[PDB]
Amino acid sequence: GLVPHMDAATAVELLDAQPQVWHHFLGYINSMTLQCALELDIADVIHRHGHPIPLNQLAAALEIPQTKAPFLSRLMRMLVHLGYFTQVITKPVLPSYWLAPLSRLLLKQNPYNARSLTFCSVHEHLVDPWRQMSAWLRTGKKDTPNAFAFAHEGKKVYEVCSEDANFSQLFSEGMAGDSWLFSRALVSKCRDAFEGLSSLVDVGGGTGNTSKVIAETFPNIHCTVFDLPGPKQTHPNLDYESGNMFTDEIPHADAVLFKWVLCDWPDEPVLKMLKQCKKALTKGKLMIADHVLDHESCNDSNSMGTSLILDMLFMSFLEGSLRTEKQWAKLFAEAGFKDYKITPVGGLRVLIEVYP
Amino acid sequence: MDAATAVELLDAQPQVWHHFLGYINSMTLQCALELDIADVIHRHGHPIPLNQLAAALEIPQTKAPFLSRLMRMLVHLGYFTQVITKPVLPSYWLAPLSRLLLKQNPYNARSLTFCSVHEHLVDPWRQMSAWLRTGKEDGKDTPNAFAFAHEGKKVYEVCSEDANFSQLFSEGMAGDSWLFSRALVSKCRDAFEGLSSLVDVGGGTGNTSKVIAETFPNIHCTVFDLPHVVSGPKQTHPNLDYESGNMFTDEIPHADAVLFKWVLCDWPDEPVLKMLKQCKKALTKKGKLMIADHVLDHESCNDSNSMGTSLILDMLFMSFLEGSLRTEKQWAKLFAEAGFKDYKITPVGGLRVLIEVYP
Ligand SMILES: COc1cc(/C=C/CO)ccc1O
Ligand SMILES: COc1cc(/C=C/CO)ccc1O
């Protein structure tokens, strides 16, 4: 507890390095300010106004008392920096706010909005286990598959979802929203990968957002969503079968699609399932719509940072990871597949076609 | 919606993901500190293989693959490096940023990190929207979300109840002052010319005043802070001493210069103005006011990265303190209302500047 040389140049360098560290450890402030913006329906209230909205009118619409309007102003300034909104001053300080392009992803009226995924991701269920991550890392085989289970009395995310209907709904809605956008990019960027197919099984396809878009875009593909037992998407060439992809036989088709599924699981069950696909597809192909971590299409620093953040998220609450091409290729080889082709799609993700 | 628009939106989505997953940065860095990774690697003295690192951290070899993934994250963040040994089994070393993580360095950021990610500071954010919607007519309002989420208790009261949390905060401030003061006396040497005395209001355990006193032998430095803050180990020097009191309600010691380093940002305009008026009167009984703090819109912190961090601090302070990061306009207004006649801003670093304010 008692009190403990450096030249000025070094002191200044280190002083100027500190804010990078502050920015990292205060990262949760981004999470929480964005959540507030969603709780308050800020984007929707601004959109509804129809043109830039003055701070006082924004506060009134948000049921924020005028005494607290200066705090709202500061929250808005944060959200403007993050890229969601713009601000201007038309009175010679009352700003007026409008929408920036990134706010398209916040608007309730857009079926691709990220609201539910945001609420899910910042939920106590997903944040809290991180305070036991170090203890979990230090636990030998009191062990659990991940930090999430470690902090939930041994319960994996599937079990917690069955107990927490709200949390479960958020997760489901978040996946559906992503599928809305991803599928549309997929059928455009990878049109060639669907040519010549007459059937496809969408493993883990849920309410059918991915298959709906595939069926609409390629009218000769009979799509079957295969998943564990709201209303599901309707289309004449879209149907549904129930089953466990690990223990039940996957429906036969010209292509087996895994969209954001294999990343949830470790090598041993994935390999076992891939081998079963190998036996079944012999002759069709595997279609994996997921992350290839080191791929050229997502190798910029910002993209890599977000990929690694996802790898950490997945490490904490799922049983998988974001695999590199080398890791994928090793799984394909051991599963008996002979060839593969990667086509970039977007959103940190690609299509891998795998041939048996 | 056409394909081009769908792809554009798909490629924009990870920006939002990165925002809402910001707490992952907070928690992975906290893990690195809990596990003492920087010091373990430093003690090893050369790059350390993954298996040896797991052993050194008391992580079972069975969980080494998870450690590898945590390290990959931390390497991206810039704390560590992976030293390539072959054209698998990664070896890890230290990056320059890790200097701020090492326990042996008096300027390390460990305590501030632990303080900042603590439940006390994170949890009130889950009530921020409710607090923003609370009016002053139900008896439920509080000065900030922190108090709203702590049964009305401000951070000062929670610190008085939570000795560990309090110690983290104080150590955090001291570490920053160690660096900031050394930058201050170099980049703003002329600001100290001609002074015979200085009072460091909120100067804590004396890291700022110690450096001033050593660098400028004519300046008698007095740290003025709360009794409990100045009753323990602190910097000592023959021209440095400590006086105790409350800056809001007790008379601030007389000096040629009154210094506020990262203090006025904690408080709103009404008490700050009152205090500045008291200083104006004292400094013309001419002395000067010295404010070492953020000027939000200063050129030295205008880059996107710096502004992002400044706004994050502005949010942090909104949640648990009663202040903000002021713009030049806001500062200038305070100085005018307090009766000062001139000012000069000189950049120091760490998002902050020195404002000299003259009566
Ligand atoms: C629950 O939060 C998230 C989950 C995923 C999961 C993708 C595939 O299982 C991706 C991003 C998130 O923010
Ligand atoms: C408790 O966490 C923090 C507090 C401050 C306070 C500075 C002046 O009062 C600055 C940065 C932090 O991370």
Measured CA to CA, the distance from residue B190 to residue B184 in angstroms comes to 10
Chain position carrying tokens 């036969």:
A252
- Give kind and range of the element (H or E) at residue B223: strand B220-225
| Cα torsion through B260, B261, B267, B271, rounded to 10 | 0
The bridge status of strand B91-94 relative to strand B48-49 is: antiparallel
What sign does the dihedral B199-B200-B205-B206 (CA atoms) show? Answer: negative
- Strands, DSSP E only, in A219-328? 222-227, 238-242, 255-259, 285-290
* String of DSSP letters for B106-161: TT--HHHHHHHTSHHHHGGGGGHHHHHT--SSSS---SSHHHHTTTT--HHHHHHH
How many A/B residue pairs have CB atoms within 8 Å? Answer: 294
Token pair belonging to B37:
């990774």
Question: What is the spatial distance between Cα B215 and Cα B219, in angstroms, rounded to a whole number?
Answer: 9
Q: In whole angstroms, give the CA distance from residue A214 to residue A193.
A: 11
For residue A212, give the nearest of A244, A243, A176, A245 by alpha carbon: A176
**Which regions of B34-118 does DSSP assign to beta strands (E)?**
48-49, 80-83, 91-94
Ligand 1 probe mutation, A35, A209, A260, most atoms within 8 A of CB: A260
Choose the closest CB to A312 out of B19, B28, B186: B28
Residue B246 annotated as binding site:
yes
The pairing of strands A255-259 and A199-203 is: parallel
Residue in chain A closest to B207 (alpha carbons) equals A3
Residues 6 or more apart whose CB falls under 8 angstroms from that of B117 comprise A25, A28, B26, B27, B29, B30
Cα distances (Å, whole numbers) of residue A92 to A56, A88, A95: 16, 11, 11
CB B317 within 8 A of CB B143: no
CA angle B294/B296/B298 to nearest 5° reads 95
Q: Where are the domains of chain A?
A: 1-106, 107-356
User: Which residue carries 């791929």 as its tokens?
Assistant: A295
Cβ–Cβ under 8 Å, residues B148 and B127: yes
- CA distances to A118, A152, A182, B18 from A348, in Å: 18, 30, 11, 12
Helix H or strand E encompassing B201: strand B197-201
- Alpha carbon separation from A15 to A57, A167, A281, B7, B330 (Å, rounded): 41, 42, 60, 41, 25
- Residues 6+ positions from B124 with CB-CB distance below 8 Å: B131, B144, B145, B146, B148, B149, B150, B319, B320
Percent helix, strand, coil in chain B (nearest 5)?
50, 15, 35
Residue A117 Cβ inside 6 Å of ligand 1? The answer reads yes
Taking the mean position of all CA atoms in its chain, how far away is CA A186? 16
Q: Do domains A1-106 and A107-356 have the same CATH topology?
A: no
**B122, A28 in Cβ contact below 8 A?**
yes
Q: Are B320 and B116 in contact (CB under 8 A)?
A: no
The two three-digit tokens of residue B138, written as one number: 């139900």
Q: Which residues of A touch B308 (CB under 8 A)?
A: 23, 81
Q: Side-chain half-sphere of A332: how many Cα atoms within 13 Å?
A: 21
A90 touching B (Cβ < 8 Å): no
Q: How many residues does chain A have?
A: 356
CB proximity under 8 Å: B 297-316 to A:
305-309, 311-316
Parallel/antiparallel/unpaired status of strands A96-99 and A255-259:
unpaired
CA of A191 to the centre of ligand 1 (A): 26
Contact B19 CB / ligand 1 (< 6 Å): no
Look at residue A309 and give its three-state secondary structure.
helix
The answer to whether A24 contacts B25, with C-beta atoms less than 8 Å apart, is yes
Residue B246, both tokens: 């409350």
Buried residues in B21-60 as b, exposed as e (16+ CB within 10 A): bbbbbbbbbbbbbbbbbbbbbbebeebbbbeebbebbebe
* DSSP reduced 3-state for B175: helix
- List phi, psi (to 5°) of A223: -100, 135
- The CATH T-level fold of domain A107-356 is Rossmann fold (3.40.50)
Q: How far apart are CA B313 and CA B316, in angstroms?
A: 5
What Å resolution does this PDB entry report?
1.6
What is the bridge-based pairing of β-strands B257-261 and B240-244?
A: unpaired
Both ends of chain A: CA-CA distance in Å?
66
Asked if B346 has any chain A CB less than 8 Å from its own CB, the reply is no
- Nearby residues of A49 by Cβ (< 8 Å), 6 or more positions away: A57, A58, A61
The answer regarding whether domain B1-101 maps to CATH 1.10.10.10 reads yes
Pairing of strands B48-49, A199-203: unpaired
Amino acid at A224: T
A123 vs B contacts (CB less than 8 Å) = none
Domain A1-106 has CATH 1.10.10.10: yes
CATH of domain B102-359: 3.40.50.150
Q: Determination technique for this PDB entry?
A: X-ray
Tell which residue, A260, A152, A163, has the closest CA to residue A203: A260
DSSP A232: P
- β-pair type (A199-203, A222-227): parallel
